[PDB]
């Protein structure tokens, strides 16, 4: 007698790493890289219309 088991194949996907600038929503927002929010207390913005 011969009786064996067969792993006939293996499949995988990939985590499609979307990039937020490669995206239609990107002109809604000036996304700014400011690494110093941790030591920051507060910011303000004044407006002169």
């Amino acid at each position: 007698d011969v009786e064996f088991d067969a792993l006939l194949g293996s499949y995988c996907n990939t985590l499609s790493l979307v990039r937020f600038l490669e995206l239609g929503l990107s002109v809604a927002c000036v996304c700014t890289k400011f690494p110093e929010l941790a030591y920051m207390n507060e910011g303000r913005v004044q407006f002169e219309v």
């Binding site: 194949g9 293996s10 499949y11 995988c12």
Partner: protein
């Protein structure tokens, strides 16, 4: 893991044949009638 695991082997041989292709959206699809082709006079009813 950026793995080459699944398959990339041999690029098999290509041959032309009569068929039909429609464009429903950007998914382009065959068409097949399976009555006059193979179940012509066969006594098995078409599925």
């Amino acid at each position: 893991n950026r793995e080459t695991l699944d398959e990339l082997e041999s690029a098999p041989q290509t041959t032309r044949v009569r068929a039909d292709l429609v464009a429903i959206g950007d998914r382009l699809v065959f068409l097949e009638a399976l009555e006059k082709r193979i179940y012509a006079a066969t006594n098995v009813p078409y599925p």
